[PDB]
Amino acid sequence: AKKAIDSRIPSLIRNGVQTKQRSIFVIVGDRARNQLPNLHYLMMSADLKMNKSVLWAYKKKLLGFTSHRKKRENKIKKEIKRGTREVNEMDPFESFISNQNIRYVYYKESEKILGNTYGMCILQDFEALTPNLLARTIETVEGGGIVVILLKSMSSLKQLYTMTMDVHARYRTEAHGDVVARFNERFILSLGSNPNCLVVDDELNVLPLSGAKNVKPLPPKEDDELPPKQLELQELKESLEDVQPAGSLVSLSKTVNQAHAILSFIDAISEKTLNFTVALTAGRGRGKSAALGISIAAAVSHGYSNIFVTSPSPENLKTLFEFIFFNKAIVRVDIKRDHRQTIQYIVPQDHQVLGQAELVVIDEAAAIPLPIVKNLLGPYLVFMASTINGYEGTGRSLSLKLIQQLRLREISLDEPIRYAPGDPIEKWLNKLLCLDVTLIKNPRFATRGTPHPSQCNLFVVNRDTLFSYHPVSENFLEKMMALYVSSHYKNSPNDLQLMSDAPAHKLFVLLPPIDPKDGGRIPDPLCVIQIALEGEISGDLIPWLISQQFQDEEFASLSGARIVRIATNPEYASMGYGSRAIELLRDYFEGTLPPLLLKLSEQPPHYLHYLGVSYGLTQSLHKFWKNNSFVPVYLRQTANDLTGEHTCVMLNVLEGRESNWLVEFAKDFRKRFLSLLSYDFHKFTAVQALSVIESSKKAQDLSDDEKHDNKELTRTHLDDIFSPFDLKRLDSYSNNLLDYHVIGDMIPMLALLYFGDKMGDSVKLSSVQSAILLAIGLQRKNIDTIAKELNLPSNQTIAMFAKIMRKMSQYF
């Protein structure tokens, strides 16, 4: 029973390990455990130099065995004592377990595998494949490598059988509820279209049903199968020895991208412009931090004195300090000295320290708020480090608009330090994960040239048909996702799985009108809207947070929808296509396959009491919704590190139900904001506060209400609160002889009871004067801070102050 094996299997593994690539296998079957270690031994015997370690990832179970060596040895010893074996017996699988090197890892601990390199990885649980996870492991598998997925489930077995028998039809059972792994179906089909993948069973009877069904063995008997990056490795290299103190470190530098990025930094060292940043946009692990190590090496060998390191968090300063080449002194440690020995990490909020400093490096600029970004782009020298094509941070267009609101040359790192370029798994992964965002740069719509909003149309998407892997639908999907990534600032990879498989989530496209010729060419979106049905119709967010902030069993019984994403482009931000789409969607609510594109008409929505948008608070979008028709509902208090802005939610209702509890909430929330100023957003912009308070004023002075209006205060309660000596000193500073502290003692509650609508109607001072009042009595900041806020270098501040408190005095 020493059976044969099809040529595809060892042919693929040998060809991969001599092309420095990665292969991927999926095993259906009853065991797969016994068929694994044959592959591992086979891969070493294909090549004796490649890395040994195998990573095993699982959700919470282990297939028929356990890891603790004491447990396995005790069990097997006791099995000898109970007499079920022979003394010197160990099967191939358990041999593999207790002989190789394994890192076991959970799913949730997926972040402890970042910097390592593994020879093989194993994914045990197929029905919980987070995109973020899959990105982790596949990126960290070294070249000449194997990625193997185990597929013990009859459910996926029937799924794949059905898909192979009919690509168009599928198999969906509602025994799960309303959750179906459309992302996993797309995974399986794209894997079918992979150029070096394989689907195989137990006993390795390879299935031709999918994958690279026909690989041929290369003749690897040659030394010239060598990439152009290898071919133009350093050949005019000044590696000579009479003097080469940086030539040593350039020879340490690995790729040609690393080498001429180092050339960029040395040209920058020669360059003596003051306000300057040297920009590296990199793929991940491609020599970014390595270039950081050579940059710090060169800039302490020859640079000013040393550099301040700035990071939003302590990320792998592990490797940033692990770049070495003996403690620092004036001895021949220089080319090893310009490294770990000056351990002084600082916090990136010390931008004035940075302005003083000789040279500053910034790492992963995508997690830095833009005011901090400019405060570090003062008039001095900075090395900017960021990851394009990348999770957890910025995008290409986001970084370009960053440097354009900023400002010099940029450099992008691409060549992977581990595996071979042009990699099939890397390309296929970029395709499936959909991070190839270049659709903005395409020559059809590289410019902003778009029609006018007189005719634009919403389309609801049959997302099942969308995520069904059909190439035109696929094409449409990267187009819209490129829009999505350009629209946001920072993105997570699981979100694609989120809207693909989340039942209550819906997507809409504002599109130009149909081409009247045939409708055969590709539609090209203008805006994309992501919402989710949330409420008693059932999404854990909105009624929960409302119930927490105010006891409202009525709100618990309510049902509506939350807008998660508005999706436009800075090329289209000129006019308000989003406002067009907003009006259209609000009008829709309050007024052999299923088709790829469904018209908005043939799908009745449910009964939506309310619509609420959730977003990180900014001036532009706040102004946008404020010009639009949403009630300011809630603002958080602690701005996170990443966004730098407190979260904030808007609501809007316009139905036959005249709500007015929204108006009650608006009055409460304006009062709450009045409380919360000078507490947590003690220091933020007064005109922003002004915009918020007047938007709240609009919201609680919307239509359909008459008891929500303010009643006039009483002079009885006035004298109840104040003191006649305070009134005397009010008239005294009205005579302008006293001190502004002796008025600021009583300024803030004057602002408080002033900012009620009684005094709002009595005396109208809604200008820069009211801005100054808000700043000095409720933002409670210095007169000097107000002065440089208004950029008025004189006592104009006290001029308007004297005017307005004078107006108060003749009121009194």
Binding site: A1, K2, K3, A4, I5, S7, I9, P10, N34, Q35, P37, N38, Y41, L42, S45, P92, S95, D202, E203, L204, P217, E241, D242
Partner: protein, 43 residues
């Protein structure tokens, strides 16, 4: 034991069978004449 069986495989010619289941380089830098060798080394 590469040519022999281990695990459960043995590798044939191709068809794997499985079971059932500075002065140093200055001197030796040979495209240099000794004249400029000693000239550089003196400087």
């Amino acid at each position: 034991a590469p040519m022999s069986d281990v695990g459960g495989v043995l590798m044939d010619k191709d068809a794997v069978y499985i079971d059932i289941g500075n002065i140093g380089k200055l001197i030796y830098m040979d495209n240099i004449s000794p004249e400029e060798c000693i000239r550089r080394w003196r400087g």
